[PDB]
Amino acid sequence: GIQGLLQFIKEASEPIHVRKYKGQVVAVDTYCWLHKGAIACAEKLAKGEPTDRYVGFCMKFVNMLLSHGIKPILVFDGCTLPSKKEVERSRRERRQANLLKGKQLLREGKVSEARECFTRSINITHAMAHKVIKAARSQGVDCLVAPYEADAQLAYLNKAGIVQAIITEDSDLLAFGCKKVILKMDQFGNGLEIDQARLGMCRQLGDVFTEEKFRYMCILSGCDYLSSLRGIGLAKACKVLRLANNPDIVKVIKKIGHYLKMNITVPEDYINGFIRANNTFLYQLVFDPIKRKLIPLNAYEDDVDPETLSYAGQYVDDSIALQIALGNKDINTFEQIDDYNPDTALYF
DNA sequence: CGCTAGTACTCA
DNA sequence: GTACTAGCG
Ligand SMILES: [Mg+2]
Ligand SMILES: [Mg+2]
Ligand code: NA
């Protein structure tokens, strides 16, 4: 998530209703809904007790979309990104800590406190996601498990013209170069839509409305793949990018002190970290639903060697990739949990 | 004014 | 994943 991006470009947003996309196809960042609905039954999840409330919670939204003549594509997070492993470890430690503390408060008598910790302990597994997948596919709703981050997969589906809008809460979708993003959507169909073309309505951006410059800005402000230099947020990064008559981003990164008059000295590690972050935003592996193969989010440019981009996700055989995409192969255990086949009983 | 980091929150 | 803001440059 880009910390503060939604508030920074709020002039590019407008209140809409999803009836706007009647007859069209939209993709869904389902893990948001999963995280929301899991909270309704955090006690049972923490205690290990069985619960299927989040399933109905998601299917509620799904049916809401279906009622307005919309075809929703539920997209799920797949395997872990090495380039994001920091935030993943952080959140893991967080959830585990709140879990142990929750158990402690459970055996201390503290009720609401332990329940709160349980809310802050929920780890969305592929099992729950697969419950939602079966529940959705039972009603003809297409589902897709990304090879890695759902963000990149959604971005691809939107760029490929397969879907016309992305339903999510994460601002990263804009940094991935999505055209239309529906945020803050409730269970009725009311949400805030940010359009890429409307980024020009943001006076603060300046000439930083192009996909490349916008990406550079989001990265420089601080993303999930790279922490920002101390003292650098959205405004100063956008300032740097505005005051630059140079397409070569690296030289600009080095001259950040000049462009800001802040006397900043950049570490040599941060340059490579930036290269890696940009390469992750650009070339993270996604799954083609049509050709059924692992491709990068954007086509490889001639100035990059795919061999060096393992942190943007490593390749597997397209059979495995397809079985993952269908939700048959467990993301964690890598063992088969289902045997669904889109041929026997999208992807056309 | 901008940015970091801590707090609080997503359900019902 | 989010929003809010007190402390501070
Ligand atoms: Mg995501
Ligand atoms: Mg993201
Ligand atoms: Na920052």
Say yes or no: Cβ of A234 under 7 A from any atom of strand C: no
User: Closest by alpha carbon to A129, among A325, A313, A312, A286?
Assistant: A325
> What is the enclosing helix (H) or strand (E) of A76?
strand A71-76
- Domain shared by A35 and A77, yes or no: yes
Known binding positions of A for Mg(2+): 29, 77, 149, 151, 170, 172, 224, 269
CA–C1' distance A3–B4 (Å)?
11
The enclosing domain of A186 has a CATH number of: 3.40.50.1010
- Domain shared by A137 and A15, yes or no: yes
**Type of residue numbered A55:** V
- CB of A173 closer than 8 Å to CB of A224: no
DSSP string computed for A131-191: HHHHHHHTTT--EEE-SS-HHHHHHHHHHTTS-SEEE-S-THHHHTT-SEEEES--TTSEE
- Domain shared by A44 and A192, yes or no: yes
CA–C1' distance A184–B4 (Å)?
25
Distance from C-alpha of A198 to C-alpha of A228, rounded to nearest angstrom: 26
User: Closest by alpha carbon to A78, among A345, A338, A320?
Assistant: A320
Question: A225 C-alpha vs ligand 3 centroid, how far in Å?
Answer: 13
- Domain shared by A249 and A297, yes or no: no
- Domain shared by A140 and A248, yes or no: no
> What is the enclosing helix (H) or strand (E) of A29?
strand A25-29
Question: A173 C-alpha vs ligand 2 centroid, how far in Å?
Answer: 7
Last residue of a domain, one of A284, A304, A334: A284
Residue A301 has what DSSP assignment? P
- Domain shared by A320 and A264, yes or no: no
Reading the block at residue A44, the tokens are: 């049972």
Say yes or no: Cβ of A7 under 7 A from any atom of strand C: yes
Question: A245 C-alpha vs ligand 3 centroid, how far in Å?
Answer: 23
Residue nearest B3, CA–C1′ metric: A231
Question: A238 C-alpha vs ligand 3 centroid, how far in Å?
Answer: 12
Question: A103 C-alpha vs ligand 1 centroid, how far in Å?
Answer: 28
**A106 CB contacts (<8 Å, ≥6 apart)?**
A114
Last residue of a domain, one of A206, A235, A269: A206
Give the domain range for residue A46: 1-206
- Domain shared by A132 and A165, yes or no: yes
- Domain shared by A276 and A289, yes or no: no
Ligand (nearest to CA of A221) = 3
**What's the angle, vertex CA A182, arms to CA A177 and CA A187, rounded to 5?**
155
Method: X-ray
Last residue of a domain, one of A150, A178, A206: A206
Signed CA dihedral, A135, A136, A142, A147: sign only: negative
- Domain shared by A15 and A124, yes or no: yes
Distance from C-alpha of A36 to C-alpha of A3, rounded to nearest angstrom: 20
CA–C1' distance A120–B9 (Å)?
10
Distance from C-alpha of A177 to C-alpha of A180, rounded to nearest angstrom: 9
Burial class (CB within 10 angstroms; exposed 0-12, middle 13-18, buried 19+) of A62: buried
Say yes or no: Cβ of A172 under 7 A from any atom of strand C: yes
CA atoms within 13 A on the CB side of A30: 34
DSSP alpha helix (H) spans, chain A? 5-8, 30-39, 42-47, 53-67, 85-106, 111-119, 126-137, 150-159, 172-175, 211-221, 234-242, 249-254, 256-260, 268-283, 318-325
Kindly list the protein residues whose beta carbon lies within 7 Å of any strand B atom.
Answer: A 3-4, 32, 35-37, 39-40, 53, 57, 119-120, 222, 228-237
| Spacing of C-alpha A147 from chain mean position | 12
- Domain shared by A177 and A250, yes or no: no
Distance from C-alpha of A116 to C-alpha of A295, rounded to nearest angstrom: 41
Distances (CA, A) of A323 to A160, A177, A253: 21, 27, 41
Residue A14 has what DSSP assignment? E
Count of domains forming chain A: 3
Distance from C-alpha of A88 to C-alpha of A71, rounded to nearest angstrom: 31
Distance from C-alpha of A182 to C-alpha of A191, rounded to nearest angstrom: 6
- Domain shared by A182 and A104, yes or no: yes
At what resolution in Å was this solved? Answer: 2.6
- CB of A95 closer than 8 Å to CB of A46: no
Phi-psi map region of A68: left, alpha, beta (phi>0 left; psi -120 to 50 alpha): alpha
- Domain shared by A123 and A220, yes or no: no
